[PDB]
């Protein structure tokens, strides 16, 4: 049973940085891409980017470049995303999603990390 | 960036009814389009990919159709476990763009 | 014969025969690419388009390579096998590249006839580049779905880029499959590329080798070296412009952004190699699709081994793709050191003198103080002269052949370039 | 006394042009 256990909700002051983690369980961590998705409150989804865990080459959405940085830890089978210079518009739910393999559809999703930027 | 417009933004129907969602595409994606269903307060779940192929474990009442720049998802004999948001997402090539989302409600 | 008889014969002896033969040997490929361009505008099912281009690719491969074409066909099949067995892995690039490497190495150890293999380096190189490119684009997420058999086959046998054509991305081929309107800019691009291809063919066969005795009253080892170099450069530009023309004729080779479609496929830039700024620009403007391929799929992966070892691995991959000959291997091994030393020395110089003398033109917002001064111009022109000198010394190998021939050709020139780059490197390390 | 030149991709005689 594949399970992408994602970090807990974070509350960050504006201008700071946050780091979400998505620990993989149930398959070979370096076997499939690990896309990151963002969803505002009751709005559509947005593909931030993915990271290939085999060779750590990443692929960013140019709307999210410089803001989100992906890293991996293969010994813990964990995928980290770091958001830099958080503003009020960055308060959303961030999912990690494994690619389906053959296609790049997101087959297995995390549970979401609620990032809240306020006072 | 490809712009996936989805219609309608919100529709209502009874149990056992039949509904249809459309996902018009800015550019031409050949047959690469997927449908996710997200319930209230949970993560999305892949239902259809390649615009017609039902993923393993989805009832046969969900039917994808279309190709080019006009795709659709049909749900006949609407059941209580079929109410949520439906997002179309092309998997033609990065960057992957999702649709606006169709909020299916109980009538 | 003297210049009198030379120019008395020139036109009817070389300019018309060479052009007539160049046209008689490519007219069928051009007709097939045009037929594919016209057929892909009718609104057929996509699989039918891919099957039609597979048939056209078989016909073109047979016309150019009579029956040896199997050594290409087989390769394609093998590639798809390696693409189907690991269609779920993130290793697709690694598996396809290792398969291509083992295949080319077995081919270059005379498991295949040494004249059958030498004839199909240009088709096998493009097929291997396309397969490795698709395998890596699927890993990095730039291509969504692993293609069906007919899409992969129609990609490898794309009738526009099968014989001479450059490497094109899988998506840059799918966009050609979905078809664009037959504009007038399309026809202008095809016509200008064909005219420039014939012009470079003419200047390579006729004007190239007979430059300095006849066209110039100058005349000698360095003059022969330079005329061999320019004949080689124009023989390359011929294939570059012809591949550009035959890829823009079939529909591919275009970029569109916000309701503006431009046919801007450039394979070679002759003015960046004939009037060079540095050897980095020469290497990256000799073949632009191959430079992008080698930088994106060989350098960006081997970059873990350090920048210099990654440059060496990239030039080794380039020497393996182009077929392992000793003169080409020596040229591409000297080019690694030449470009690296020149790049890093110009880097340290532009950092010291604060002048814009970098091996590539600086962008409008840069820290350098002296940008348009005449000392900067003098230094840039000195480095351009050094680039022309390197180009002559390296192209002297292609006079129209293993270790003896290359050591003989380079021993006449006193190994001038291999001492020039050594001096540049010790100068780099002194001002370090 | 005709000489032939080969133009092609990475060697690979594909366009041969000869002349006296
Ligand atoms: C005629 C063709 C043929 C082929 C081809 O072209 C023409 O030329 C060929 C060229 O030669 C290429 C090869 C060159 C060398 C390349 C090496 C690369 O693999 C590695 O690439 C690294 C990129 O960073 C990854 O990251 C390592 O480095 C750190 C980065 O943060 C990690 O930390 C560490 O973990 C990773 O690697 C680590 O892996 C750990 C194992 O868990 C080890 O413990 C540890 O040591 C090591 O640090 C690493 O993870 C990954 O494995 C991968 O690209 C395979 C590779 C061989 C390439 C395959 C494809 C090609 C053959 C290329 C190309 C298409
Ligand atoms: C005699 C002669 C020969 C040539 C000549 N030039 C180029 C090529 C192809 C080639 O290797 N391109 C290439 C492009 C980029 C890179 C690269 C990218 N990133 C990092 C490191 N390297 C490597 N290689 C072939 C020939 C015969 C030019 C002039 N005079
Ligand atoms: C000088 C460089 C920059 C340009 C060279 C252009 C060439 C084509 C020009 C320059 C000098 C010219 C030559 C000089 C004089 C002669 C001798 C005559 O009996 C035949 C024509 C011929 C041979 C001319 C042909 C055209 C020519 C060769
Ligand atoms: C600065 C240096 C490292 C640049 C490269 C040096 C090499 C390429 C140069 C320097 C001296 C040259 C050698 C000196 C003389 C001979 C003997 C002859 O019978 C074969 C060629 C050979 C062997 C030359 C080959 C090229 C050579 C080896
Ligand atoms: C027949 C091919 C012979 C090729 C020989 C090359 C000649 C060497 C010329 C200059 C030496 C420059 C060495 C630079 C090494 C850089 C290493 C580093 O800085 O990490
Ligand atoms: Zn500058």
Choose among C317, C307, C294: nearest CA to C340.
C307
C145, two tokens: 């779905």
List the residue whose alpha carbon is closest to atom 9 of ligand 1.
Answer: C298
Choose among A68, A61, A67, A114: nearest CA to A91.
A114
Q: Indicate whether C88 and C156 sit together in one domain.
A: yes
Q: Please tell me whether residue C141 adopts helix, strand or coil conformation.
A: coil
Residues 6+ apart with CB under 8 A from C192: none
The C-alpha atoms of residue C11 and residue A48 are separated, in whole angstroms, by 62
**What are the Cα distances from residue C315, in Å, to A118, B47, D11?**
52, 46, 17
- Kindly list the domain boundaries of chain B, sorted by start residue: 4-106
Q: What residues of chain A lie within 8 A of the CB of C87, using their CB?
A: 101-102
Ligand nearest to the CA of C312: 2
Choose among C22, C272, C270, C279: nearest CA to C164.
C22
Q: What share of chain D is helix, strand, coil (3-state, %, to 5)?
A: 0, 50, 50
The C-alpha atoms of residue C33 and residue C399 are separated, in whole angstroms, by 33
Distance A56 CA to ligand 1 centre (A): 9
C96-102: long-range contacts, CB 8 A cutoff, minimum separation 24: C96/C131, C96/C132, C96/C134, C96/C135, C96/C136, C97/C132, C97/C135, C97/C136, C97/C297, C100/C128, C100/C131, C100/C132, C101/C320
Q: Please tell me whether residue C370 adopts helix, strand or coil conformation.
A: strand
Choose among C212, C226, C231: nearest CA to C385.
C226
DSSP secondary structure letter of residue C431: -
The CATH topology of domain B4-106 is Immunoglobulin-like (2.60.40)
C-beta of residue C280 within 8 angstroms of C-beta of residue C360: yes
* C198: enclosing H helix or E strand: helix C184-202
Q: Indicate whether C8 and C59 sit together in one domain.
A: no
| Burial per residue of C106-139, b for 16 or more beta-carbon CB atoms within 10 angstroms, e otherwise | ebbeeeeeeeebbbbbbbbbbbbbbbbbbbbbbb
C-beta of residue C335 within 8 angstroms of C-beta of residue C283: yes
Choose among C37, C393, C76, C382: nearest CA to C181.
C37
C122, two tokens: 């240009």
Cα C360 to chain centroid, rounded: 20
Q: Given D10, D13, D17, which is nearest C18 (Cβ)?
A: D17
Q: In this structure, what are the phi and psi dihedrals at residue B24, rounded to the nearest 5 degrees?
A: -75, 145
Q: CB-side exposure of C119: number of CA atoms within 13 Å?
A: 19
- Ligand 3 pocket residue status of C216, Cβ below 6 Å: yes
The C-alpha atoms of residue C137 and residue C167 are separated, in whole angstroms, by 14
Q: Indicate whether C292 and C244 sit together in one domain.
A: no
Residues 6+ apart with CB under 8 A from A65: none
The C-alpha atoms of residue C383 and residue C396 are separated, in whole angstroms, by 20
Q: What share of chain C is helix, strand, coil (3-state, %, to 5)?
A: 70, 0, 25
DSSP secondary structure letter of residue B16: T
Q: Please tell me whether residue B69 adopts helix, strand or coil conformation.
A: strand
Ramachandran bin of C361, using left for φ above 0, alpha for ψ from -120 to 50, beta for the remaining angles? beta
- Ligand 1 pocket residue status of C391, Cβ below 6 Å: no
C363 touches A: beta carbon within 8 Å: no
Q: Which residue has the tokens 């005219």?
A: C195
* Residue C41 distance to chain B (closest CA, Å): 15
Q: Please tell me whether residue C2 adopts helix, strand or coil conformation.
A: coil
Q: Which residue has the tokens 């067995």?
A: C85
List the residue whose alpha carbon is closest to atom 19 of ligand 1.
Answer: A55
Q: In this structure, what are the phi and psi dihedrals at residue C409, rounded to the nearest 5 degrees?
A: -65, -35
CB within 8 Å: C171 and B93:
yes
Q: Indicate whether C261 and C323 sit together in one domain.
A: no
- Which residue of chain B is at minimal alpha-carbon distance from C172? B93
Q: Indicate whether C285 and C423 sit together in one domain.
A: yes
Query: Which of ligand 3's atoms lies nearest the C-alpha of C4?
Result: 19
Q: What residues of chain A lie within 8 A of the CB of C139, using their CB?
A: 33, 52, 54, 57
* Residue C138 distance to chain B (closest CA, Å): 9
The CATH topology of domain A3-114 is Immunoglobulin-like (2.60.40)
Its domain, for residue C328, covers 279-430
Q: What residues of chain C lie within 8 A of the CB of D17, using their CB?
A: 17-18, 21-22, 201, 205
C69, two tokens: 């074409």
Q: Given D11, D13, D19, which is nearest C205 (Cβ)?
A: D19
Q: Where are the alpha helices (DSSP H) in C203-325?
A: 221-249, 271-274, 279-286, 288-294, 300-302, 307-321
In chain B, positions 21-60, which contact chain A (CB-CB < 8 Å)? 32, 34, 36, 43-46, 49-50, 55
DSSP secondary structure letter of residue B7: E
Q: Indicate whether C58 and C155 sit together in one domain.
A: yes
Distance C398 CA to ligand 4 centre (A): 20
β-bridge partners, B105? B12
Give chain C's contact residues with B (Cβ, < 8 Å): 46, 140-145, 171, 174, 178
Annotated resolution, angstroms: 2.9
DSSP tally for chain C: helices H, then strands E: 21, 2
Choose among A11, B67, D9, A10: nearest CA to C118.
D9
List the residue whose alpha carbon is closest to atom 2 of ligand 3.
Answer: C216
C26-30: long-range contacts, CB 8 A cutoff, minimum separation 24: C26/C242, C26/C246, C26/D15, C28/C60, C28/C63, C29/C60, C29/C63, C29/C64, C29/C159, C29/C163, C29/C164, C29/C246, C30/C194, C30/C245, C30/C246, C30/C249
DSSP secondary structure letter of residue C355: B
**What are the Cα distances from residue A102, in Å, to B32, C38, C80?**
12, 33, 14
Q: Please tell me whether residue D16 adopts helix, strand or coil conformation.
A: strand
DSSP tally for chain D: helices H, then strands E: 0, 2
For C194, counting Cβ atoms within 10 Å of its Cβ (0-12 exposed, 13-18 middle, 19+ buried), the class is: buried
Full strand arrangement of the beta sheet holding B10-13: B10-13, B102-106, B85-89, B34-38, B46-49, B53-54
Which of C213, C243, C268 finishes a domain? Answer: C268
The C-alpha atoms of residue C393 and residue C223 are separated, in whole angstroms, by 10
**What are the Cα distances from residue A105, in Å, to A47, C56, C336?**
11, 33, 41
Q: What residues of chain A lie within 8 A of the CB of C141, using their CB?
A: 33, 35, 50, 52, 59, 99, 104
Which of C238, C268, C298 finishes a domain? Answer: C268
C-beta of residue A30 within 8 angstroms of C-beta of residue A54: yes
A36 touches C: beta carbon within 8 Å: no
Distance C15 CA to ligand 3 centre (A): 17
Distance C379 CA to ligand 6 centre (A): 14
Residues 6+ apart with CB under 8 A from A107: A97, A98, A99, A100, A101, B46, B55
State the helix-helix crossing angle for C326-352 and C416-430, rounded to 10 degrees.
30
Which of C143, C177, C211 finishes a domain? Answer: C177
A23, two tokens: 């620990």
Q: Where are the alpha helices (DSSP H) in C287-373?
A: 288-294, 300-302, 307-321, 326-352
Residues 6+ apart with CB under 8 A from A102: C87, C88, C145, C146
The C-alpha atoms of residue C328 and residue C369 are separated, in whole angstroms, by 41
Chains C and B touch (3+ CB pairs under 8 A): yes
C197, two tokens: 């291809």
The C-alpha atoms of residue C108 and residue C54 are separated, in whole angstroms, by 27
The C-alpha atoms of residue C31 and residue C35 are separated, in whole angstroms, by 6
C343 is catalytic: no
Give the Cβ contact number of residue C423 at 10 Å.
11
Residue C236 included in any domain: yes
**What are the Cα distances from residue C340, in Å, to C17, C312, C343?**
42, 10, 5
The C-alpha atoms of residue C365 and residue C376 are separated, in whole angstroms, by 17
Residues 6+ apart with CB under 8 A from C365: none
C-beta of residue C59 within 8 angstroms of C-beta of residue C83: no
Cis before B95? omega within 30: yes
Q: What residues of chain B lie within 8 A of the CB of C171, using their CB?
A: 92-93
Distance C210 CA to ligand 2 centre (A): 26
DSSP states along B31-59: S--EEEEE-TTS---EEEETTTEEPTT--
The C-alpha atoms of residue B98 and residue C33 are separated, in whole angstroms, by 37
Residues 6+ apart with CB under 8 A from A57: A51, C139, C140, C300, C301
List the residue whose alpha carbon is closest to atom 6 of ligand 5.
Answer: C334
- Which residue of chain A is at minimal alpha-carbon distance from C137? A59
The C-alpha atoms of residue A81 and residue C79 are separated, in whole angstroms, by 35
The C-alpha atoms of residue C385 and residue C278 are separated, in whole angstroms, by 9
Cis before C222? omega within 30: no
Q: How many domains does chain C have?
A: 3
Q: Indicate whether C305 and C331 sit together in one domain.
A: yes
* Dmax (CA) of chain C: 69
Q: What residues of chain C lie within 8 A of the CB of B30, using their CB?
A: 46, 174, 178
Full strand arrangement of the beta sheet holding B68-76: B4-7, B18-29, B68-76, B62-66
Q: Which residue has the tokens 């961590």?
A: A29
Choose among C108, C36, C135: nearest CA to C322.
C108
Q: Indicate whether C420 and C335 sit together in one domain.
A: yes
* Residue C189 distance to chain A (closest CA, Å): 31
Residue C25 included in any domain: no
Length of chain A: 119
Distance B96 CA to ligand 1 centre (A): 26
Q: CB-side exposure of C395: number of CA atoms within 13 Å?
A: 27
């Amino acid at each position: 049973e594949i399970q992408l256990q994602q970090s807990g909700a974070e509350l960050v002051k504006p201008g700071a940085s946050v780091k979400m983690s998505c620990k993989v369980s149930g398959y070979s961590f370096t076997g499939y891409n690990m896309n990151w998705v963002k969803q505002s409150h009751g709005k559509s989804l947005e593909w931030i980017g993915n990271i290939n865990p085999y060779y750590v080459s990443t692929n960013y959405n140019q709307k999210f470049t410089g803001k989100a940085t992906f890293t991996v830890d293969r010994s813990s089978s964990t995928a980290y995303m770091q958001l830099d210079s958080l503003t009020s518009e960055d308060s959303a739910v961030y999912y990690c999603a494994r690619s389906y393999g053959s296609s790049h559809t997101f087959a297995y999703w995390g549970q979401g990390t609620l990032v809240t930027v306020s006072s | 960036d490809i712009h996936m417009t989805q219609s309608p933004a919100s529709l209502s129907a009874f149990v056992g009814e039949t509904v249809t969602i459309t996902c018009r595409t800015s550019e031409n994606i050949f047959s690469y389009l997927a449908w996710y269903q997200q319930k209230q307060g949970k993560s999305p779940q892949l239902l259809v990919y390649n615009a017609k192929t039902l993923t393993s474990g989805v009832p046969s009442r969900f039917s994808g159709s279309g190709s080019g720049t006009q795709f659709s998802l049909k749900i006949n004999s609407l059941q209580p476990e079929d109410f949520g948001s439906y997002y179309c997402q092309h998997h033609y090539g990065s960057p992957y763009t999702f649709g606006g989302g169709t909020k299916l409600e109980i009538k | 014969f003297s210049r009198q008889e030379f120019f008395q014969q020139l036109l009817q002896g070389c300019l018309l025969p060479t052009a007539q033969q160049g046209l008689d040997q490519i007219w069928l490929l051009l007709a097939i690419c045009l037929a594919c361009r016209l057929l892909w505008r009718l609104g057929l099912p996509s699989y039918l388009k891919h099957a039609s281009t597979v048939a056209g690719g078989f016909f073109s491969l047979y016309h150019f390579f009579q029956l040896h074409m199997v050594w290409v066909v087989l390769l394609s099949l093998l590639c798809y096998l390696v693409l189907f067995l690991c269609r779920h892995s993130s290793h697709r690039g690694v598996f396809l590249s290792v398969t291509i490497l083992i295949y080319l190495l077995m081919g270059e150890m005379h498991m295949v006839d040494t004249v059958t293999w030498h004839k199909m380096r240009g088709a096998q190189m493009i097929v291997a580049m396309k397969a490795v490119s698709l395998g890596f684009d699927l890993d990095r997420g730039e291509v969504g779905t692993v293609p069906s058999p007919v899409e992969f086959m129609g990609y490898l046998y794309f009738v526009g880029t099968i014989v001479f054509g450059p490497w094109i991305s899988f998506h840059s081929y799918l966009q050609a499959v979905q078809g664009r309107p037959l504009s007038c800019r399309w026809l202008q691009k095809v016509a200008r590329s064909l005219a420039l291809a014939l012009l470079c063919l003419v200047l390579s066969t006729c004007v190239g080798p007979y430059l300095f005795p006849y066209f110039i009253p100058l005349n000698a080892r360095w003059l022969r070296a330079y005329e061999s170099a320019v004949s080689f450069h124009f023989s390359n530009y011929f294939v570059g412009f012809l591949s550009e023309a035959t890829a823009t004729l079939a529909g591919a080779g275009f970029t569109e952004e916000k309701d503006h479609l431009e046919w801007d496929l450039t394979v070679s830039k002759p003015l960046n190699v004939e009037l060079p700024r540095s050897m980095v620009e020469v290497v990256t403007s000799w073949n632009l699709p191959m430079s992008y391929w080698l930088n994106n799929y060989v350098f960006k992966n081997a970059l873990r081994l350090g920048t210099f070892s990654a440059v060496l691995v990239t030039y080794a991959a380039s020497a393996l793709l182009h077929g392992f000959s000793f003169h080409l291997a020596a040229v591409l091994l000297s080019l690694a050191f030449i470009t690296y030393v020149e790049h890093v020395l110009r880097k340290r110089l532009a950092r010291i003198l604060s002048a814009c003398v970098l091996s590539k033109r600086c962008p409008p917002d840069c820290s350098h103080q002296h940008r348009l001064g005449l000392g900067v111009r003098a230094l840039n022109l000195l480095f351009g002269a050094l680039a022309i000198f390197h180009l002559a010394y390296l192209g002297s190998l292609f006079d129209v052949y293993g270790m003896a021939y290359t050591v003989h050709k380079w021993s006449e020139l006193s190994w001038a370039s291999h001492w020039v780059t050594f001096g540049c490197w010790i100068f780099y390390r002194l001002i370090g | 006394h005709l000489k032939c030149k080969c133009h092609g991709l990475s060697g690979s005689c594909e366009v041969k042009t000869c002349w006296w």
